[PDB]
PDB file of C-alpha atoms in Angstrom:
ATOM      1  CA  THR A  29     -57.468 -19.113 -36.431  1.00  0.00           C
ATOM      2  CA  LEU A  30     -54.637 -21.743 -37.150  1.00  0.00           C
ATOM      3  CA  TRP A  31     -52.930 -19.578 -39.802  1.00  0.00           C
ATOM      4  CA  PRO A  32     -53.044 -16.510 -37.856  1.00  0.00           C
ATOM      5  CA  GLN A  33     -51.861 -18.295 -34.784  1.00  0.00           C
ATOM      6  CA  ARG A  34     -48.680 -19.617 -36.249  1.00  0.00           C
ATOM      7  CA  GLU A  35     -48.127 -15.721 -37.738  1.00  0.00           C
ATOM      8  CA  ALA A  36     -48.845 -13.898 -34.559  1.00  0.00           C
ATOM      9  CA  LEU A  37     -46.193 -16.418 -32.756  1.00  0.00           C
ATOM     10  CA  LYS A  38     -43.730 -15.578 -35.417  1.00  0.00           C
ATOM     11  CA  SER A  39     -44.252 -11.699 -35.011  1.00  0.00           C
ATOM     12  CA  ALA A  40     -43.591 -12.171 -31.391  1.00  0.00           C
ATOM     13  CA  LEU A  41     -40.344 -13.925 -32.117  1.00  0.00           C
ATOM     14  CA  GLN A  42     -38.994 -11.816 -34.773  1.00  0.00           C
ATOM     15  CA  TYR A  43     -40.672  -8.472 -34.504  1.00  0.00           C
ATOM     16  CA  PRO A  44     -41.244  -8.143 -30.587  1.00  0.00           C
ATOM     17  CA  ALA A  45     -41.524  -4.716 -30.877  1.00  0.00           C
ATOM     18  CA  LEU A  46     -44.293  -4.402 -33.373  1.00  0.00           C
ATOM     19  CA  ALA A  47     -45.819  -7.257 -32.185  1.00  0.00           C
ATOM     20  CA  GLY A  48     -45.948  -5.140 -28.934  1.00  0.00           C
ATOM     21  CA  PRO A  49     -48.891  -4.967 -25.806  1.00  0.00           C
ATOM     22  CA  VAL A  50     -51.663  -6.445 -28.279  1.00  0.00           C
ATOM     23  CA  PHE A  51     -49.734  -9.342 -28.603  1.00  0.00           C
ATOM     24  CA  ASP A  52     -48.894  -9.890 -25.169  1.00  0.00           C
ATOM     25  CA  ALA A  53     -52.990  -9.649 -24.459  1.00  0.00           C
ATOM     26  CA  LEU A  54     -53.426 -12.471 -26.397  1.00  0.00           C
ATOM     27  CA  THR A  55     -54.474 -15.315 -23.956  1.00  0.00           C
ATOM     28  CA  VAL A  56     -52.736 -18.710 -24.114  1.00  0.00           C
ATOM     29  CA  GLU A  57     -56.108 -20.330 -24.345  1.00  0.00           C
ATOM     30  CA  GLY A  58     -57.009 -18.839 -27.584  1.00  0.00           C
ATOM     31  CA  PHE A  59     -53.918 -20.208 -29.412  1.00  0.00           C
ATOM     32  CA  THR A  60     -55.799 -23.535 -29.875  1.00  0.00           C
ATOM     33  CA  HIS A  61     -53.230 -25.734 -31.332  1.00  0.00           C
ATOM     34  CA  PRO A  62     -51.571 -26.965 -28.222  1.00  0.00           C
ATOM     35  CA  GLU A  63     -48.002 -26.459 -29.569  1.00  0.00           C
ATOM     36  CA  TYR A  64     -48.630 -22.860 -30.635  1.00  0.00           C
ATOM     37  CA  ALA A  65     -50.162 -22.364 -26.839  1.00  0.00           C
ATOM     38  CA  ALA A  66     -46.817 -23.617 -25.496  1.00  0.00           C
ATOM     39  CA  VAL A  67     -44.681 -21.402 -27.415  1.00  0.00           C
ATOM     40  CA  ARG A  68     -47.036 -18.584 -26.731  1.00  0.00           C
ATOM     41  CA  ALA A  69     -46.564 -19.136 -22.778  1.00  0.00           C
ATOM     42  CA  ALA A  70     -42.853 -19.551 -23.076  1.00  0.00           C
ATOM     43  CA  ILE A  71     -43.095 -16.267 -24.569  1.00  0.00           C
ATOM     44  CA  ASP A  72     -45.064 -14.898 -22.018  1.00  0.00           C
ATOM     45  CA  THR A  73     -43.129 -16.335 -19.355  1.00  0.00           C
ATOM     46  CA  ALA A  74     -39.554 -14.879 -20.858  1.00  0.00           C
ATOM     47  CA  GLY A  75     -41.310 -11.348 -20.502  1.00  0.00           C
ATOM     48  CA  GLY A  76     -43.463 -10.725 -23.338  1.00  0.00           C
ATOM     49  CA  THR A  77     -42.929  -8.235 -26.270  1.00  0.00           C
ATOM     50  CA  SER A  78     -42.275  -5.849 -23.470  1.00  0.00           C
ATOM     51  CA  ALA A  79     -38.639  -7.434 -21.824  1.00  0.00           C
ATOM     52  CA  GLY A  80     -37.399  -5.723 -24.707  1.00  0.00           C
ATOM     53  CA  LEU A  81     -35.360  -8.023 -26.083  1.00  0.00           C
ATOM     54  CA  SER A  82     -34.840  -9.064 -29.774  1.00  0.00           C
ATOM     55  CA  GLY A  83     -32.947 -11.352 -32.033  1.00  0.00           C
ATOM     56  CA  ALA A  84     -31.134 -14.168 -31.078  1.00  0.00           C
ATOM     57  CA  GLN A  85     -30.982 -13.236 -27.459  1.00  0.00           C
ATOM     58  CA  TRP A  86     -34.707 -12.866 -27.509  1.00  0.00           C
ATOM     59  CA  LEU A  87     -35.153 -16.282 -29.257  1.00  0.00           C
ATOM     60  CA  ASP A  88     -32.961 -17.851 -26.657  1.00  0.00           C
ATOM     61  CA  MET A  89     -34.537 -16.612 -23.574  1.00  0.00           C
ATOM     62  CA  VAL A  90     -38.073 -17.838 -25.144  1.00  0.00           C
ATOM     63  CA  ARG A  91     -36.121 -21.168 -25.606  1.00  0.00           C
ATOM     64  CA  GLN A  92     -35.219 -21.315 -22.044  1.00  0.00           C
ATOM     65  CA  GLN A  93     -38.474 -21.610 -20.672  1.00  0.00           C
ATOM     66  CA  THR A  94     -39.061 -25.039 -21.891  1.00  0.00           C
ATOM     67  CA  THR A  95     -37.879 -28.107 -21.328  1.00  0.00           C
ATOM     68  CA  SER A  96     -39.885 -29.411 -24.299  1.00  0.00           C
ATOM     69  CA  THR A  97     -37.636 -30.488 -27.055  1.00  0.00           C
ATOM     70  CA  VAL A  98     -40.194 -30.278 -29.834  1.00  0.00           C
ATOM     71  CA  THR A  99     -41.277 -26.996 -28.319  1.00  0.00           C
ATOM     72  CA  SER A 100     -37.839 -25.797 -28.385  1.00  0.00           C
ATOM     73  CA  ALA A 101     -37.116 -26.879 -31.993  1.00  0.00           C
ATOM     74  CA  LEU A 102     -40.692 -24.951 -32.928  1.00  0.00           C
ATOM     75  CA  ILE A 103     -39.361 -21.707 -31.319  1.00  0.00           C
ATOM     76  CA  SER A 104     -36.423 -21.806 -33.359  1.00  0.00           C
ATOM     77  CA  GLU A 105     -38.543 -22.464 -36.525  1.00  0.00           C
ATOM     78  CA  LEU A 106     -40.811 -20.185 -35.909  1.00  0.00           C
ATOM     79  CA  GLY A 107     -37.894 -17.673 -35.219  1.00  0.00           C
ATOM     80  CA  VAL A 108     -36.624 -17.671 -38.636  1.00  0.00           C
ATOM     81  CA  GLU A 109     -39.560 -18.841 -40.730  1.00  0.00           C
ATOM     82  CA  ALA A 110     -39.941 -15.929 -43.537  1.00  0.00           C
ATOM     83  CA  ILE A 111     -43.038 -13.892 -43.126  1.00  0.00           C
ATOM     84  CA  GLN A 112     -44.011 -13.436 -46.453  1.00  0.00           C
ATOM     85  CA  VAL A 113     -45.011  -9.601 -46.977  1.00  0.00           C
ATOM     86  CA  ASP A 114     -43.306  -6.515 -47.845  1.00  0.00           C
ATOM     87  CA  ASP A 115     -41.160  -4.939 -45.251  1.00  0.00           C
ATOM     88  CA  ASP A 116     -43.422  -1.595 -45.574  1.00  0.00           C
ATOM     89  CA  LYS A 117     -46.378  -3.678 -44.863  1.00  0.00           C
ATOM     90  CA  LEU A 118     -45.523  -5.346 -42.131  1.00  0.00           C
ATOM     91  CA  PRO A 119     -46.697  -3.476 -39.375  1.00  0.00           C
ATOM     92  CA  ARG A 120     -50.219  -3.599 -40.697  1.00  0.00           C
ATOM     93  CA  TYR A 121     -49.770  -7.292 -41.482  1.00  0.00           C
ATOM     94  CA  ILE A 122     -48.895  -8.223 -37.556  1.00  0.00           C
ATOM     95  CA  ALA A 123     -51.534  -5.935 -36.340  1.00  0.00           C
ATOM     96  CA  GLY A 124     -53.977  -7.471 -39.125  1.00  0.00           C
ATOM     97  CA  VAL A 125     -53.159 -11.607 -37.591  1.00  0.00           C
ATOM     98  CA  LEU A 126     -53.180 -10.556 -34.021  1.00  0.00           C
ATOM     99  CA  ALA A 127     -56.714  -8.649 -34.623  1.00  0.00           C
ATOM    100  CA  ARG A 128     -57.931 -11.988 -36.167  1.00  0.00           C
ATOM    101  CA  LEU A 129     -57.192 -13.983 -32.812  1.00  0.00           C
ATOM    102  CA  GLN A 130     -58.606 -10.869 -30.898  1.00  0.00           C
ATOM    103  CA  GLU A 131     -61.715 -10.784 -32.420  1.00  0.00           C
ATOM    104  CA  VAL A 132     -62.480 -14.094 -32.242  1.00  0.00           C
ATOM    105  CA  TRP A 133     -61.579 -14.086 -28.305  1.00  0.00           C
ATOM    106  CA  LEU A 134     -63.769 -10.893 -27.634  1.00  0.00           C
ATOM    107  CA  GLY A 135     -66.861 -12.685 -29.792  1.00  0.00           C
ATOM    108  CA  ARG A 136     -66.685 -15.296 -27.130  1.00  0.00           C
ATOM    109  CA  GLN A 137     -66.679 -12.451 -24.090  1.00  0.00           C
ATOM    110  CA  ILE A 138     -69.579 -10.719 -26.274  1.00  0.00           C
ATOM    111  CA  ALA A 139     -71.631 -14.120 -26.236  1.00  0.00           C
ATOM    112  CA  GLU A 140     -71.250 -14.307 -22.388  1.00  0.00           C
ATOM    113  CA  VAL A 141     -71.451 -10.847 -21.658  1.00  0.00           C
ATOM    114  CA  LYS A 142     -75.061 -10.627 -23.848  1.00  0.00           C
ATOM    115  CA  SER A 143     -76.112 -14.162 -22.068  1.00  0.00           C
ATOM    116  CA  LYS A 144     -76.165 -12.515 -19.199  1.00  0.00           C
ATOM    117  CA  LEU A 145     -77.961  -9.317 -19.702  1.00  0.00           C
ATOM    118  CA  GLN A 146     -80.942 -11.483 -21.487  1.00  0.00           C
ATOM    119  CA  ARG A 147     -81.926 -12.528 -17.822  1.00  0.00           C
ATOM    120  CA  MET A 148     -81.585  -9.171 -16.258  1.00  0.00           C
ATOM    121  CA  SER A 149     -84.153  -6.173 -16.891  1.00  0.00           C
ATOM    122  CA  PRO A 150     -82.404  -2.780 -17.646  1.00  0.00           C
ATOM    123  CA  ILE A 151     -85.366  -1.114 -14.702  1.00  0.00           C
ATOM    124  CA  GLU A 152     -85.140  -3.840 -11.959  1.00  0.00           C
ATOM    125  CA  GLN A 153     -81.375  -4.207 -12.515  1.00  0.00           C
ATOM    126  CA  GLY A 154     -80.296  -0.612 -12.958  1.00  0.00           C
ATOM    127  CA  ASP A 155     -76.911   0.007 -12.163  1.00  0.00           C
ATOM    128  CA  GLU A 156     -75.949  -2.967 -12.599  1.00  0.00           C
ATOM    129  CA  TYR A 157     -77.365  -3.354 -16.142  1.00  0.00           C
ATOM    130  CA  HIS A 158     -75.652  -0.274 -17.085  1.00  0.00           C
ATOM    131  CA  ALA A 159     -72.289  -1.659 -15.821  1.00  0.00           C
ATOM    132  CA  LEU A 160     -72.646  -4.832 -17.706  1.00  0.00           C
ATOM    133  CA  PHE A 161     -73.771  -2.973 -20.507  1.00  0.00           C
ATOM    134  CA  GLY A 162     -70.911  -0.664 -20.595  1.00  0.00           C
ATOM    135  CA  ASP A 163     -68.739  -3.528 -20.703  1.00  0.00           C
ATOM    136  CA  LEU A 164     -70.314  -5.053 -23.664  1.00  0.00           C
ATOM    137  CA  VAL A 165     -70.418  -1.744 -25.341  1.00  0.00           C
ATOM    138  CA  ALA A 166     -66.653  -1.537 -24.980  1.00  0.00           C
ATOM    139  CA  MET A 167     -65.800  -4.612 -26.460  1.00  0.00           C
ATOM    140  CA  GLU A 168     -68.501  -4.761 -29.372  1.00  0.00           C
ATOM    141  CA  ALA A 169     -66.985  -1.064 -30.112  1.00  0.00           C
ATOM    142  CA  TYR A 170     -63.498  -2.610 -30.148  1.00  0.00           C
ATOM    143  CA  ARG A 171     -64.286  -5.764 -32.103  1.00  0.00           C
ATOM    144  CA  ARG A 172     -66.094  -3.809 -34.563  1.00  0.00           C
ATOM    145  CA  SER A 173     -62.479  -1.762 -35.060  1.00  0.00           C
ATOM    146  CA  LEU A 174     -60.199  -4.886 -35.015  1.00  0.00           C
ATOM    147  CA  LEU A 175     -62.457  -6.009 -38.219  1.00  0.00           C
ATOM    148  CA  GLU A 176     -61.462  -3.140 -39.803  1.00  0.00           C
ATOM    149  CA  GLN A 177     -57.915  -3.625 -38.624  1.00  0.00           C
ATOM    150  CA  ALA A 178     -57.886  -7.593 -39.574  1.00  0.00           C
ATOM    151  CA  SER A 179     -57.353  -6.432 -43.187  1.00  0.00           C
ATOM    152  CA  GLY A 180     -53.544  -5.587 -42.705  1.00  0.00           C
ATOM    153  CA  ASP A 181     -53.290  -9.716 -42.885  1.00  0.00           C
ATOM    154  CA  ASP A 182     -54.608  -9.503 -46.624  1.00  0.00           C
ATOM    155  CA  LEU A 183     -51.071  -8.426 -47.488  1.00  0.00           C
ATOM    156  CA  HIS A 184     -49.796 -11.778 -47.556  1.00  0.00           C
ATOM    157  CA  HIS A 185     -47.758 -12.655 -50.593  1.00  0.00           C
ATOM    158  CA  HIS A 186     -50.048 -15.826 -51.323  1.00  0.00           C
ATOM    159  CA  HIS A 187     -53.236 -13.790 -50.918  1.00  0.00           C
ATOM    160  CA  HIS A 188     -54.704 -12.355 -53.834  1.00  0.00           C
ATOM    161  CA  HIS A 189     -57.431  -9.848 -53.974  1.00  0.00           C
TER     162      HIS A 189
ATOM    163  CA  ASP B  15     -30.548 -48.925 -41.274  1.00  0.00           C
ATOM    164  CA  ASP B  16     -27.734 -50.404 -39.058  1.00  0.00           C
ATOM    165  CA  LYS B  17     -27.594 -53.617 -40.650  1.00  0.00           C
ATOM    166  CA  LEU B  18     -26.702 -51.917 -43.957  1.00  0.00           C
ATOM    167  CA  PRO B  19     -23.083 -51.158 -45.259  1.00  0.00           C
ATOM    168  CA  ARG B  20     -22.570 -46.952 -44.542  1.00  0.00           C
ATOM    169  CA  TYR B  21     -22.249 -46.493 -48.169  1.00  0.00           C
ATOM    170  CA  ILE B  22     -25.631 -48.312 -49.315  1.00  0.00           C
ATOM    171  CA  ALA B  23     -27.107 -46.354 -45.884  1.00  0.00           C
ATOM    172  CA  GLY B  24     -25.947 -43.060 -47.436  1.00  0.00           C
ATOM    173  CA  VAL B  25     -27.106 -43.696 -51.100  1.00  0.00           C
ATOM    174  CA  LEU B  26     -30.339 -44.579 -49.948  1.00  0.00           C
ATOM    175  CA  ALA B  27     -30.436 -41.070 -47.753  1.00  0.00           C
ATOM    176  CA  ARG B  28     -29.089 -39.133 -50.848  1.00  0.00           C
ATOM    177  CA  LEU B  29     -32.018 -40.688 -53.179  1.00  0.00           C
ATOM    178  CA  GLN B  30     -34.427 -39.741 -50.485  1.00  0.00           C
ATOM    179  CA  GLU B  31     -33.131 -35.835 -50.119  1.00  0.00           C
ATOM    180  CA  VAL B  32     -33.311 -35.696 -53.512  1.00  0.00           C
ATOM    181  CA  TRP B  33     -36.858 -37.175 -54.427  1.00  0.00           C
ATOM    182  CA  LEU B  34     -37.802 -34.710 -51.016  1.00  0.00           C
ATOM    183  CA  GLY B  35     -36.137 -31.743 -52.734  1.00  0.00           C
ATOM    184  CA  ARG B  36     -38.395 -32.034 -55.880  1.00  0.00           C
ATOM    185  CA  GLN B  37     -41.471 -32.999 -53.907  1.00  0.00           C
ATOM    186  CA  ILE B  38     -40.988 -30.054 -51.364  1.00  0.00           C
ATOM    187  CA  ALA B  39     -40.870 -27.651 -54.688  1.00  0.00           C
ATOM    188  CA  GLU B  40     -44.122 -29.611 -55.744  1.00  0.00           C
ATOM    189  CA  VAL B  41     -45.715 -28.466 -52.429  1.00  0.00           C
ATOM    190  CA  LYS B  42     -44.310 -24.959 -52.274  1.00  0.00           C
ATOM    191  CA  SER B  43     -46.000 -24.464 -55.548  1.00  0.00           C
ATOM    192  CA  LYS B  44     -49.140 -25.870 -54.680  1.00  0.00           C
ATOM    193  CA  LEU B  45     -49.243 -23.379 -51.610  1.00  0.00           C
ATOM    194  CA  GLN B  46     -48.388 -20.393 -53.750  1.00  0.00           C
ATOM    195  CA  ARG B  47     -51.505 -21.148 -55.694  1.00  0.00           C
ATOM    196  CA  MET B  48     -53.737 -21.078 -52.213  1.00  0.00           C
ATOM    197  CA  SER B  49     -54.519 -18.074 -50.114  1.00  0.00           C
ATOM    198  CA  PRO B  50     -53.825 -18.097 -46.238  1.00  0.00           C
ATOM    199  CA  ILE B  51     -56.781 -15.728 -45.995  1.00  0.00           C
ATOM    200  CA  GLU B  52     -59.538 -17.333 -48.161  1.00  0.00           C
ATOM    201  CA  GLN B  53     -57.963 -21.153 -47.505  1.00  0.00           C
ATOM    202  CA  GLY B  54     -56.019 -20.516 -43.641  1.00  0.00           C
ATOM    203  CA  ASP B  55     -57.092 -23.809 -42.488  1.00  0.00           C
ATOM    204  CA  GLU B  56     -55.945 -25.955 -45.651  1.00  0.00           C
ATOM    205  CA  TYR B  57     -53.020 -23.648 -46.301  1.00  0.00           C
ATOM    206  CA  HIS B  58     -51.924 -24.045 -42.622  1.00  0.00           C
ATOM    207  CA  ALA B  59     -51.889 -27.841 -42.990  1.00  0.00           C
ATOM    208  CA  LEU B  60     -50.062 -28.248 -45.945  1.00  0.00           C
ATOM    209  CA  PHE B  61     -47.719 -25.800 -44.981  1.00  0.00           C
ATOM    210  CA  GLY B  62     -46.942 -27.682 -41.730  1.00  0.00           C
ATOM    211  CA  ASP B  63     -46.298 -30.646 -43.863  1.00  0.00           C
ATOM    212  CA  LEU B  64     -43.701 -28.831 -46.379  1.00  0.00           C
ATOM    213  CA  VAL B  65     -41.849 -27.616 -43.102  1.00  0.00           C
ATOM    214  CA  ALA B  66     -41.495 -31.123 -41.829  1.00  0.00           C
ATOM    215  CA  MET B  67     -40.228 -32.295 -44.981  1.00  0.00           C
ATOM    216  CA  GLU B  68     -37.982 -29.724 -45.364  1.00  0.00           C
ATOM    217  CA  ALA B  69     -36.713 -30.488 -41.569  1.00  0.00           C
ATOM    218  CA  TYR B  70     -36.277 -34.106 -42.681  1.00  0.00           C
ATOM    219  CA  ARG B  71     -34.840 -33.268 -45.717  1.00  0.00           C
ATOM    220  CA  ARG B  72     -32.158 -31.539 -43.727  1.00  0.00           C
ATOM    221  CA  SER B  73     -31.782 -34.100 -41.584  1.00  0.00           C
ATOM    222  CA  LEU B  74     -31.301 -36.690 -44.700  1.00  0.00           C
ATOM    223  CA  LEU B  75     -28.275 -34.029 -46.084  1.00  0.00           C
ATOM    224  CA  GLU B  76     -26.570 -34.725 -42.581  1.00  0.00           C
ATOM    225  CA  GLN B  77     -26.705 -38.090 -42.817  1.00  0.00           C
ATOM    226  CA  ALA B  78     -25.857 -38.741 -46.483  1.00  0.00           C
ATOM    227  CA  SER B  79     -22.763 -36.604 -45.817  1.00  0.00           C
ATOM    228  CA  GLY B  80     -22.082 -38.705 -42.658  1.00  0.00           C
ATOM    229  CA  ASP B  81     -22.350 -41.881 -44.233  1.00  0.00           C
ATOM    230  CA  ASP B  82     -20.936 -41.239 -47.675  1.00  0.00           C
ATOM    231  CA  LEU B  83     -17.334 -39.796 -45.979  1.00  0.00           C
ATOM    232  CA  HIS B  84     -18.221 -36.609 -47.431  1.00  0.00           C
ATOM    233  CA  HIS B  85     -15.061 -33.732 -46.555  1.00  0.00           C
TER     234      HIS B  85
END
């Protein structure tokens, strides 16, 4: 997910209102690339997209959360680097790159819950089984929905159908 | 490059910036022929180096200007 990690950061930095609560729900651990995780953390600390800041003010606020010259320069870089997609397609593009990341993370949680359920019986473990299976249904259903959403990222200028 | 007179250090920065601008164009062209959806990891990798080149080029432009006493 390295490409959508970079695009997700650019989206949060340039269009925090579009990036929105999904972005803010993305975990730092899901940013496998260490310099990207450090930018993700700085954005979280700066208040996330909900801080309702944008533009130069937002970028400064994020840079204020880091003492790394490398992280600081990367915030500036990702704050101005073009997201290469048509303006009308930007909201679905942003949702799409965030969905890529979420999907991957949900996959891990789904696998974990399934491994727990395989050790349990729906008869002997009654209510507990219902509770954990209900958790699985919620993620599996959402994962399926994201797989459809993740399609907004196909609108990238360098992707051709 | 401190053991060089400024005008020589400057021409070498100028040489580098000109060449790198052309290489940056080469790399951008390559990226235009690759999908970040079908080849996300390769595309990201190459894009990362494009961006590093661009940043170094900007720094060489500033060094050449400084060393060559541009106004």
